[PDB]
Design a protein around this ligand. Structure first.
Ligand SMILES: Cc1cc2nc3c(=O)[nH]c(=O)nc-3n(C[C@H](O)[C@H](O)[C@H](O)COP(=O)(O)OP(=O)(O)OC[C@H]3O[C@@H](n4cnc5c(N)ncnc54)[C@H](O)[C@@H]3O)c2cc1C
Ligand SMILES: Cc1cc2nc3c(=O)[nH]c(=O)nc-3n(C[C@H](O)[C@H](O)[C@H](O)COP(=O)(O)OP(=O)(O)OC[C@H]3O[C@@H](n4cnc5c(N)ncnc54)[C@H](O)[C@@H]3O)c2cc1C
Ligand SMILES: [Ca+2]
Ligand SMILES: [Ca+2]
Ligand SMILES: [Ca+2]
Ligand SMILES: [Ca+2]
Lengths: 345, 345
């Protein structure tokens, strides 16, 4: 019935040795009253901690730790559920300050610890957020059994992206794409979605199958933020001609340990390439910045201002599907305008 | 003019404490004659090592270490070029066996080191191979300046994938896709290419812009291995109806620090979704398992048995491009056959 968690974090401000000693002594007192044990280490502005005890007590202590202003960038490396024995039975909280330790054998160990944590922080940026979520639940992501799950799938793209690449220096093109990706990822994550990959200039994301309201709201919020960005940019900025198309569909996703010894993935949506290309064509053909299928429309619970637009084909199959949008002032040739503006700047 | 490298590795077989002591003593003797210094640590079947010295000497020692049968899964975590001072000036090679150390303060440090290295090995599987290549060259991948580079782009997909997902249990579908991904990634990597992402059932990979011969050979080798797999599988195996289409094109790729604070990528190919969907349509429309554009044909140096097939449009633009294949016994409705075979199994 025991839990044990291990995490790393970063100092949010310079902390002196006496403040670290005080955190350890207060933690030892509170942990003793809760029957919790463990160890706390610091090195060059990094915290490492291991906590063990009854599951409910550990969960409540950890939530408090997450709100402590004195550190940030919390990353849980390991969560062990149904723990057999305690590893630190005599330590309510033992504090080890490695900055102050001068022992002969510990010196190369400090170098090694610092190098491993820095490499870890780089790897963190290039990996999905699902893997870390699975890790915090006590599961090794390589050991998950496969499952099929219904999702709302989100695809967004940049209008006339090739014009940017043809007319601007490469450093400017990267500035534009990064501004776009930052807007999309912030809003999708705020509404409970998960960005799964970038495919060229296209953002691919998932929402739960009964969260169509959140997927529609995220789409409208992205359109609103891009209009604000276009209007508020400096004179002559390429951001003034950044436009997006968005399409939503429903699909069967497989979660599991996918890939080869060389490269792994956590999820696969078969024929994702074809669904994305068909939605891109629809936003262009209809001159509508947001389109979605009847399946998405029917999963929504709120009274959105829906409008029927046309029939299309989204899957490889030959069924004819009704396509909808939202009728509002927001959604009410761009490529020709983009080329001329970018030309004379 | 000094270099310093840090790497981790795994024991390839049980090694006793005396064999580890012997590796350290021989390393100390050879390093002293080469003016190289550093430290070697072991814990629970993991090696950690730091080496420092003149760049040419370090490079030659490291190549020998990579060939030593006694460890495997070498991963360079950090490479520092133009090093100022030595960190271990009095240690030709100091050996620290942590399995045998019982010191009070070192016990929680061993637990922490083991947990960090295990988390690292998981993250390794979900990250591209480019990042690690850039790391070994002494560069932090988040600090690269953006560059545009010509590449040969490879896209391969599974014929009638939706039929597999509709007719088999999910664990069987994953078995099929993993067999496919393993074949493709092994052959692409052997021919000098790099797999960059999986997009649904589609493999996306890059070859250097003057390596069309290697991209064509990889494609032919994948087709050959899949025919062998189909013929040699057990009676009733779904692998008997695994077929692939492959398309090659040339494109301008941007390398850099791409993305948001939430998620980063190393490379972007604009409109990758559209190029992949157009090549998929061509393999189906022509009933040809391998297609490529005139640009790929013209970058090849060997005297391949080229055959002209048709004109098509690959980019968003309106230029009409000649499409070619290779005329051989290999390349000389499948979906209907797949459904019937999968139905009665
Ligand atoms: C790195 C770090 C580790 C901490 N560890 C613990 C801990 O193990 N136990 C604990 O009670 N508080 C710990 N705290 C402090 C915790 O965040 C609260 O400040 C503390 O519990 C006081 O809570 P209170 O509001 O009830 O007063 C830690 C804080 C930091 C920054
Ligand atoms: C983990 C490990 C670390 C090693 N470190 C060194 C080293 O620092 N220097 C060295 O000369 N050899 C080192 N070796 C040994 C090296 O791989 C060769 O076995 C050794 O250099 C003998 O080379 P030789 O063929 O010339 O005889 C190491 C081997 C292992 C397994
Ligand atoms: Ca496909
Ligand atoms: Ca209809
Ligand atoms: Ca696009
Ligand atoms: Ca022609």
């Amino acid at each position: 019935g025991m839990k044990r968690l291990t995490y790393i974090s970063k100092f949010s401000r310079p902390l002196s040795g006496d403040e670290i000693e005080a955190i350890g002594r207060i933690s030892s007192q509170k942990n003793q009253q809760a029957n919790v044990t463990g160890v706390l280490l610091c090195l060059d502005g990094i915290f490492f901690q291991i906590l063990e005890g009854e599951a409910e007590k550990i969960d409540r202590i950890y939530e408090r730790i997450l709100a402590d202003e004195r550190h940030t960038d919390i990353l849980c490396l390991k969560s062990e559920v149904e723990v057999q024995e305690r590893m630190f039975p005599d330590w309510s909280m033992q504090t080890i300050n490695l900055d102050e330790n001068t022992d002969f054998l510990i010196r190369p160990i400090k170098v090694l610890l610092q190098t491993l944590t820095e490499s870890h922080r780089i790897l963190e940026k290039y990996t999905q957020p699902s893997i870390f979520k699975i890790i915090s639940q006590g599961t090794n992501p390589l050991n998950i059994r496969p499952k099929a799950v219904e999702k709302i799938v989100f695809f967004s793209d940049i209008v006339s992206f090739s014009t940017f690449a043809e007319k601007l220096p490469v450093e400017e093109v990267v500035s534009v794409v990064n501004s776009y990706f930052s807007v999309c990822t912030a809003i999708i994550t705020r509404q409970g979605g998960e960005v799964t990959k970038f495919i060229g200039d296209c953002v691919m994301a998932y929402f739960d199958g009964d969260c169509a309201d959140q997927a529609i709201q995220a789409s409208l919020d992205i359109l609103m933020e891009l209009e604000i960005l276009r209007n508020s940019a400096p004179e002559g900025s390429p951001l003034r001609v950044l436009y997006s198309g968005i399409g939503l569909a429903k699909g069967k996703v497989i979660e599991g340990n996918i890939g080869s010894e060389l490269k792994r993935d956590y999820t696969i949506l078969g024929d994702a390439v074809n669904v994305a290309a068909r939605l891109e064509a629809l936003t262009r053909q209809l001159s509508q910045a947001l389109v979605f299928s009847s399946e998405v429309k029917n999963s929504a619970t709120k009274s959105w201002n829906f409008i029927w637009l046309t029939d299309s084909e989204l899957k490889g199959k030959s069924e004819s599907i009704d396509i909808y949008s939202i009728d509002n002032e927001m959604t009410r040739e761009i490529a020709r305008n983009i080329g001329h503006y970018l030309e004379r700047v």
